[PDB]
Structure 1
Amino acid sequence: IWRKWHVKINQGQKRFATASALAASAVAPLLMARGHQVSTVPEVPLVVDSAA
């Protein structure tokens, strides 16, 4: 049980990876490469009104 199960990652590297993922999330070709069906989406990144 004392095998290394968990990996310690720098918080800066975690936040950098999150920022890169959010930057890739605004690229409509990368959505197609990811495999989601976003052809009928009006705009990327998709913003819905908070009143709804």
Structure 2
Amino acid sequence: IWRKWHVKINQGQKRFATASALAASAVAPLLMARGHQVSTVPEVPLVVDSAA
């Protein structure tokens, strides 16, 4: 049971990777390259009004 199960990651690297994934989510070629059906999406990034 004392195998090393958990990996400690720097919080700066976690925040870097989260920002990189957020930036990649605004690129529509990468959305299609990840297998998403976004051909009918009017705009990327898709923003919906908070009243809905």
Q: Look up the SS of the partner of 2:8 in the other structure.
A: coil
Counting matched residue pairs gives 52
Helix, strand or coil at the partner of 2:24: helix
- Structure 2 residue runs of 5 or longer lacking an equivalent are none
**TM-score with structure 1 length normalisation?**
0.99
| CA drift at 1:49 | 0.3
Between the two proteins, what is the percent identity of the paired residues?
100
Deviations for 1:6-31, whole angstroms, at most 9, x for unmatched residues?
00000000000000000000000000
After TM superposition, what 4+ stretches of structure 1 lie above 2 angstroms from structure 2?
none
1:44 is the counterpart of 2:44: yes
Instruction: Quote the Cα distance in structure 1 between the aligned partners of 2:6 and 2:39.
Output: 39
Quote the residue 1:16 is aligned against: 16
